Amino acid sequence: AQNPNCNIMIFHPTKEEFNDFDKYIAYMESQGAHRAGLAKIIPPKEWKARETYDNISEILIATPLQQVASGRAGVFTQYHKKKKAMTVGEYRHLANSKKYQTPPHQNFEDLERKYWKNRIYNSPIYGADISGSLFDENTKQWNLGHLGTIQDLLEKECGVVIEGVNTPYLYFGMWKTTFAWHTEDMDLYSINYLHLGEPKTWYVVPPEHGQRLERLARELFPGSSRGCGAFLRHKVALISPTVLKENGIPFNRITQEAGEFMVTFPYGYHAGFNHGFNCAEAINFATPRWIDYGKMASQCSCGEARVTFSMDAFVRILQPERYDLWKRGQD
Template identity: 25%
Template sequence: MPRLLESKKNSNPSTEKAEVSNRKRPVAIKRTVETPPLSYDLSSLIEAPIFHPNEKEFNDPIEYLEKIRPECERFGICRIVPPASFKPECQVADAMRFTANNQYIHRMFRRRGTNSRKLEAIHRHLRELNIDYQPAPCIGGIEVDLPGLYEAVQDLGGPGHVLEKNLWAKVADTLKIPRGAQDRFSKLDTIYCKYLLPYATLSDDERSKLLQKVDSQQNRQSIDDEDEDECIIKGSSMPLSTFYRIARNTFSVWFPNANFSATDTSVLNPAQVEASYWKLVTRRAAHVCVHSGNIDSGQSGYGFPCNKTSRHPWNLKVLTNNNGSILRSLGPVAGCTVPTLHVSMLFSSSCWYRDPHGLPWIDYMHTGADKIWYGVPALQETVLKQAMDKLVPDLVKGDKSVWLSSDTVMVPPTMLADQKVSLSRTVQKSGQFVVVWPRAFTSSLSAGYSVSESVCFAPVDWLPIGESCFKELRINNEPTVFSLQQLLWSIAHDNRSTVNVLKRVFPILKPGIDEEIQLRSSLRDFGVQHWKKLSASESNQRSDGKKRRLPSTTDESDMECDVCQASLFFSRAECHSRADSPVTWCLIHALQKIKDHPRVTQHVRVFFVHDEDELRKTVQTLQDHIRTKSLRRSTSHQRSSTL
């Protein structure tokens, strides 16, 4: 999924674009919640619709998606199996580097479990001894379960007996250390001596007190290592070849009897993967870390090819410029209009999520193992929120309309179904598309190594949804990937825009321009005297000359308000009351700050690209353009009727 969408602002999606968000969720009041029994009966889930378009129907993706939309939106997702002739290339290379995300499966549902509790105690003791435990110790690219290693050694008689009898082979098998990992016995010995021997030499009473401190700290909502309260964090940079090797090792750990490669799970039932995954997620007894990667294909050139011989309309790099998608006027936006390449391994997950802008998006599986998707349609949001608030109250923002952050939680679909949430499920195979409809919630998990690609699109009917979503994001102080004002402005100045599209844009763009003009007038009335019109080349710099959050769709650090985090397009205000970098505000919050603190007025400077006359002219020109085009269309229709 285009996870760069959120990570673009927070680093998430995005990409996501290709880092996990570093913004921490506000601390919630912890409630004691019991874990309901986990059901493996998938019959309570609805099968998402599957479509098999013929060659003719497969000519125009947006047209076909609009055709099937009425049937699909009530499911949230659908799967499309292309005609057999559709066999696009996938451009990847073993040397392709990207920053991987570390996904901690045992923290996906609830952050705290028996394993996490013991690991925090071990980490706490290591900190007291000034022993660095980051990065986490790995063997074969897989993080070692330190609490599991401690217990395995204790079960075999303790460290003295294991060291004396050299029982590391039994320890390795207990921990499911990949048999093909180089020097796995000596590495286990080294890891134990460095990270666990100090903990093992403590008395039972000392270890008990350590655990009590961990429990007390959790109750106070205080965490020494914030990463330990997240289920997905930024990992290390690696080439695709290394990622594949780790994927192969991970697969062999959990399915050692499967005699095929990590790229082929044709004989492995996806339900078998689901059962193993959800056990790990809900029991939280073992430390399990897998990886995923999200790569901006616009910069790397990977994924779908983009050349004259690969112009199939369902090529996602072509689809993004389809004349049925109004996003084409926006230009390249990482993780939105520029496809994102996703690499996954066994148990790689996409947490429950929906696009913050309410955009529909499409995912194509280039190669690899199956991916299991779950979908909740937009109409089920209230029921889903009630279920989430009951099952994982600490991980949802119950007091906000934007209540679910990305990369936050995986709740078993059967548990949600038990709470009366209507879910659909589908298994995406190599060479197939999955479409996510506007404002739908989705999650997914991978059955092995795979490479997929996704991109957003937007038919003109999305505009009222988008307008509502952008207002919601602003009220909730949530970031956006692009400015709605910029999209509307771009559509209005795009010669390719049809009269029908312009008619839908006008009633949203005009009030926005009217508000902009009024805000500028109010700021002048309150005494703001420093105004500067910027050229296109100047708009990418702050007044102190430093580049910062440019109002450019091709930059990953768009200018945003420091209060509401809205992407700024028409103008921005900077407050230079501090000696360090200026604070950036949208005009709404600049006016609010001036009203609350009149003294800041003298420090405020307003920068804009289009003056009021140009804004008014755009409104008038657009209105005249619509009238002229409509008249021509009406005249042409009348002539056709008389003939």
């Protein structure tokens, strides 16, 4: 069995290997990359996402989100308070302001220590989940707006034609902006490209050990767990690496820098934070190996999770027994 310790693997494809996206995902899995839940892919030196980032300031962040924490430094939830619209140029200036800027630090490890010590005492503002793309239309390799769609994959594997669409999302971050512990919708893969700016630190639990994280979360968030049998679908809970280690939960960590891709694998729980002003692009995708994870994905039916239109068909076809309850939680 390849990668039996479930280490995060880093790949350096050549320009020739960068042509066929599906083939390269299958290659990484042949080497055991999925066992970690997360892999890094460093593009060949010949590749670029677009020519420059000099002309992005007029993108609108319609609903910036202030991420307010509750709890203790290593075990907390966050809620998202909506703020007034602002442009990317306005948001960048805000991120660089004395109130929000990255503090002085020695290295990524010192910054990680400061994040976990101090995150709860501040409320950073995140431009998340903005439909759009920063890949040039002429970028033919690993262009996250030109991937094969999940509806086409389901149709190819299972023969059923379904409605829905699959488009990318932009994320504008600042110091301490935080992504809570989650797997993807329907336990899909994700791919994330860090277009510019400061790094993103990731934490990940191997898919084969995801239920260990779920059991700890039920212990640590006991009211939330009574409210919903899949409350991590709400994407609000944080647990630090120190708490994970104290409770014996297997995990790994890695820092993504600008110009790098990350892939999350089906049922790979992940969480993390941004180091300073940055912009990432991400999208969900599927492969044939995903189908069995999709069929077994947990679902929130309490009303909190609310998701896109396009997830309807996935539940309806893959999980018909669960469909009626889940759809009620969507309405």
